[PDB]
């Protein structure tokens, strides 16, 4: 079953609809880097789920009551208790996105020779932390590092890995858990309410820290209600407030489930750390009540993220990424499984099988859609993985990937077919699509500027 | 087939739907009239694409530069010189909607007495007519009055009555002719090229003034390059500007094919006719330089009129109203064909059978689908016909139709799903709706807030 | 004493700042004729206060939230409870401004041969009168047409005329009483309590209607709290409440003293004629529940006409006024006293008493004021009055005034003195002022094209 | 004089002043911080021109276009090629705002050890500096820090100052020159282009960088303008760009004379830095395409800073500010000398003369202002200047000051006679405010979240 969209259009973004001739053109002057485009020359943008939400009529009315007094803003006390209420925690601190919030926390927590162990990391999450002298332990379960595995909850920690660590380092040594929800490294992928009891539990007992990376927390409260037994009566808000329950506080990307195209916050109960956090946020964001947003974006952050709970628009907001991933599974194409809350993942090392990596094929596929479609994708394989400088090889990934990550609200399911549509048609004369070569590549970032040409 | 949206969507707005219990009483607090119903009592509203369209960024960022000058005004430059280069009239004097317009036209352009022949009535066009002293003739071609009849341009005007009525009556009785674009009540059904060409020689021949009702002349334009020969590579715009060159004038009512909430205008080529049209808009509307719009709505309109030239945008907005009529047709669903530019009209004299038109079966149906379904519709048989104003009889029009139908960029495919699935479900149980007789009847326009019973 | 604006800037509207030499320029390419500039090149724009209000960022919130449905938005529901709130009135039927109100009026309540008695009459409002048959007679207080005379109330309707009416015509041949507040005519003159309860004693024993032409009837409240004995401790909301519990119905534009730019209603108590208003609405205007506006208009206007009721705003407002009066009243520049809710009006007849009429003294002075400040202002003298087409001869109206009309929250009282500064400078040197003389004068409505030169 | 505003009002927000007795209560609950007050509770917020600056109708026009595509969005394009039109810079990185720029320049450009000099300190500036392990050097000229001494350009480094910097410590311990236009701490006092000339040419023989805080650059230009000799006739644009030429790259805040409510960006001419910038915004900020802001934003800061360039806008804004000092000065109200660009300061030594700077007068002026007239202004003094790093005792500036801080395009004359009518008033019994002592103050930046109490 895919449901419809349970809102309607109230306004449009114009597009060129420029034809595959011209697009092809576009794509050489990008020098094959799908990172290189200009927006204007797209149709169907699927770089990023962040901050490209569409947002309600709601939003829009509040961006019009911006009430942008540097300090004791409205929106700022709106925000506050919207959080509050829907996430439990007592203090709330404002962060332009959410590395402002990453930032702030990995200052306020960790000792430089700790350990910080998470299931999984992103990339900006992992650099705070290790950047305030952490080392960085994966704790996930094994299964989710084995991207063709369909089974449920697949983001959950490994608690026996847990334990580990703490009988090997000692608990006075671990500056916290990092929860993330969903794990993006695994395609997007969720954490089981079951889960997070356990490391609360096993964590409480050690007067360990946890705290939860929940740009995805809404997507994660949609898979516990669809697939974990017990929560079928509980509403997305219930489940959401369950989840942060297990938590000492959070950092949390608004750009992503709170719908908006900016924002984010840092939660925390604990009274000292969230004075701590006033006097650092000052530093690198801004004041306690705006955190480097104007007054209008807190006021579409608490507006979003109140809407984010509704049932309806969170199921059709996965079921839409379903659809896609179900479509391409159906016709043969090789993605990551279970496709995740927010992108389908694309296995380039499958699709181009006659392709060695050294010849980029997460790049030239994401080339070869946006010529055939006018669907920009983000390459996630070789490319994003860099360079060691120290040795000028590779960093080669074992996921070697095309993410076609989807914005909240923005897309139909008839977008969804010209993408899907477009990607089946490549996959039937797959063994046509060219290696690539680098003609220009920057020594850092490369992804952002490489230039390309087909071998 | 159908092409995916030309467009993303920029913001939106939520939908939700009432129980069923609760819509039987919303139905019957209505007096069985749909255009009684509340909008928030409503799911998927396709009572009229009549203002009801989604904007583009582009028109909201016009909408943040209204000029709201009495005279003067940017906005009103911008339409008036807009207008000028895609219609090809010398003048434009702005209206708040398309009834106003002819509210002038029919004022300056009717002696007592006179005859005005159009292809098919429409309610308040026909009333503003009559009212001003004018014989309603009718001289669309005989095939436009039976729903079921596959013909293409059935809106053409029948030349050999367009000639009778000339020899009949003599051309100097003859207030103008009226040439609707497409034509609302045979489906949204076009005029063809050939045919606009061959009245503008048959009425200049005798000097009879010709005025289109360009209020869907984009959606008509739509239809001659898709299917009249020899304008398979002309431009929307190009199409739209040989049309009006077969015209002395038209009303405008732009809440249809220019994209807005509101707006119309009134066009003409003659310099005294366009003196007395500005002092008549002064005691109706406002001064010609606004026209009872606010300079953002001119604007908006003058904005969207541009926009509605793009040839993807008007080849989605038909086949999305195609696709619900396939879908319908697909499953034996009654309907008027071809399906029109706007809307899919039911026939619910086939819907119905059940029912005489005396029992109002379009006014019934209509009823029925919001009670079973939600969806709004509206009625367009014999409630809307009106009463012939000499024997004060039910005007008796073949077309018994209820209309879903569709406003510009605001719904999807899935949407269309919707509505035709439940469609199909009420069509298997069709012999439960009832007949209606009047309770409260308008003396004119009746069907706008008629109250019913069921008998 | 003159109040600070008891609001601050959310948002600005650019203007050019041309300089004089160019400013001359632009007004002789407008042959000396303010109706022609371009807004674009207008610094201060005092041609009218209607429509040209500045919104706040409420009422912008509430433009986000346009419920566009055909029938029944929720903004037409904010709108009516607004209206029922306030004014107290048991109907309402939105227009699109004021004069769709009193064309719907002028047809529910006239009888052919009837009359209509009045505090002085606007050109619409007495058009829609005269055009449905009825006669008008005013029946002002003599004082209304002594320019000069500075006495309170000055709108108020001579109890004494009203009744040698009734005693000479008989109450069944009275349509109604149109009670006006403020009265434009005599420069924006108030109307006192006492007055309109003494009208409404005097018609009720005769059975004789009531409706008001209520478009500056906030300014028209400030006046009676601030100068009837008694009112010194009600609200405006009180106030303006018991003003229309004296009438039967009123018209309202919106564009004036509802802040918006668009947008007016009709009101009245009576079931019957309330029936037969939605029965004709939707011939000229619209829905019962849109009436010819937008539904992000319906709910600027429910917004607006609350935020008029504020204490502060209202005095500021008339204060403003007050305020440029004041300082042209000290300089010696001759007005119209008392200075009115809304306007000034210069005494040009005075001003260049040494020009003839017949050499347009307000059309001259109306050019001189732009050249010399970048201010629009508007002719209200012989040119706005027109030409006798029967004999030819000009109207020669008694009053030869150049109106400085001030809208509601979008100028200072530094762009009030950069108006009195230039006033007064030209007075200063006032012979130099030359004649004008038509050098184009079109047929009807000449005020709003004709050209001039020199003499 | 004094011009009126270049600009018409488009919307307002309402503001409105809570009793003394509750203002009482306000500020001891903030504990006498007027930056713990809640907007809410504020009449006329002085407390910052940062980011509370009314935007015009062509920036929300803007707001409504924002492209939200992670990389190549049309906005991002829009601010850099105006950036590299009007600063003239090779390179341009955006950040969410000031301080962002900062932590990026300061961890780019900043050996361990060595040593910035600048024309006076900033909060947030010098803390980057200091953080990243350079040594602050103050190298403005002497009179910069005596409040009463009206001297022109008292922003001007001492090149004395400067170069004994450089023989004492030699060229390559000097990180950089951090010349800031204006000099917000000394008065918000200008820069001569002299200097800046000179100033680049000491530092280019050294091959020392100099880096230009360009917060409020635009109103420096226009001290340029109007007082140094030979600028008279150059365009406020041309004095920019010339400015720019003695830099290798800025900071800029552009919530200040960019004219938004959040934005700013790096500036820089070397391509090795601009690619190490680029590696560290993303850690911090967002992708270089958006550097931690909205599409809309970075449109809205391209349109605003072309807007800033316009004499007349940025004359009134200053002659605006010169405006409440000059009433004040009439009056013998003690304040820093010349009035700067964007505040008035009063010098809180002379209004509190009886009380030591170690009582903090200036926080205690501050909480005295809003209590007695609801208007918030911000410390600037002792409790801004922080505590030296090495002995723990406060810094002690000579300028103990209140802030005055006018937001641009926010307020009228009238706000200003309102704001000085009341400090006047509270000038006559200047010897009831008393000395203040911490009961909380933070680590760092201690003046944004310190609470006091009386002594
Ligand atoms: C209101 C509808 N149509 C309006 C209309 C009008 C009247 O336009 P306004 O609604 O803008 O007055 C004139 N001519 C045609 C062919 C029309 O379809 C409708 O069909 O729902
Ligand atoms: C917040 C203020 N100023 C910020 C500022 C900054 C920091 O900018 P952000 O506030 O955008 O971080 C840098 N440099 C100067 C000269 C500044 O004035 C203020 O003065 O209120
Ligand atoms: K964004
Ligand atoms: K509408
Ligand atoms: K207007
Ligand atoms: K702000």
Not at 45 to 60: R, Y
Not at 100 to 128: C, D, W
Not at 340 to 358: I, K, N, P, S, Y
Request: negative net charge; glycine residues 8%.
């Amino acid at each position: 079953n895919y449901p419809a969209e349970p809102f309607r259009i109230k306004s449009v973004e114009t597009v060129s609809m420029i034809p595959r001739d011209e697009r092809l053109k576009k794509m050489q002057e990008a020098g094959y880097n799908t990172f290189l485009l200009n927006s204007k020359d797209i149709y169907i943008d699927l770089l990023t789920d962040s901050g490209t939400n569409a947002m309600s009529d709601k939003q829009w009315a509040g961006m019009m009551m911006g009430d942008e007094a540097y300090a004791g803003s409205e929106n700022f006390y709106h925000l506050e208790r919207t959080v509050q209420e829907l996430f439990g925690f007592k203090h709330i601190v404002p962060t332009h996105q959410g590395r402002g919030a990453e930032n702030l926390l990995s200052q306020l927590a960790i000792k430089p020779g700790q350990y910080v162990a998470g299931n999984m990391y992103f990339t900006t999450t992992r650099y705070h932390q290790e950047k305030n002298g952490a080392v960085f332990v994966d704790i996930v379960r094994d299964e989710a590092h084995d991207a063709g595995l369909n089974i449920a909850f697949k983001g959950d920690i490994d608690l026996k890995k847990l334990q580990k660590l703490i009988d090997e380092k000692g608990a006075e040594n671990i500056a916290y858990i990092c929860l993330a929800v969903t794990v993006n490294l695994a395609g997007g992928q969720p954490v089981s309410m079951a889960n997070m009891r356990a490391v609360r539990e096993l964590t409480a007992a050690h007067g360990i820290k946890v705290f939860y990376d929940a740009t995805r927390c809404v997507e994660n409260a949609y898979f516990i209600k669809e697939q974990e037994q017990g929560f079928e009566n509980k509403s997305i808000a219930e489940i959401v407030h369950e989840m942060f329950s297990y938590a000492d506080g959070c950092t949390m990307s608004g750009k992503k489930d709170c719908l908006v195209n900016i924002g984010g916050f840092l939660c925390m109960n604990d009274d000292e750390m969230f004075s701590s956090a006033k006097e650092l946020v000052v530093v690198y964001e801004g004041m306690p009540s705006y955190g480097g947003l104007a007054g209008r974006d807190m006021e579409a952050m608490a507006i979003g993220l109140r809407e984010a709970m509704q049932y309806e628009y969170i199921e059709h907001r996965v079921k839409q990424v379903r659809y896609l991933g179900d479509k391409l599974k159906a016709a043969g194409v090789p993605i990551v499984e279970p496709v995740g809350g927010h992108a389908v993942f694309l296995d380039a090392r499958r699709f181009c099988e006659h392709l060695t990596q050294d010849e980029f094929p997460a790049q030239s596929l994401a080339a070869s859609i946006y010529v055939e479609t006018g669907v920009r994708s983000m390459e996630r394989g070789i490319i994003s993985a860099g360079r060691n400088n120290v040795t000028g090889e590779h960093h080669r990934p074992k996921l070697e990937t095309v993410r076609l990550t989807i914005p909240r609200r923005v897309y139909t399911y008839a977008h969804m077919d010209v993408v899907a549509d477009g990607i089946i048609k490549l996959y039937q004369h797959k063994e046509d699509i060219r290696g690539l070569k680098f003609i220009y590549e920057p020594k850092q970032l490369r992804f952002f500027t490489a230039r390309f040409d087909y071998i």
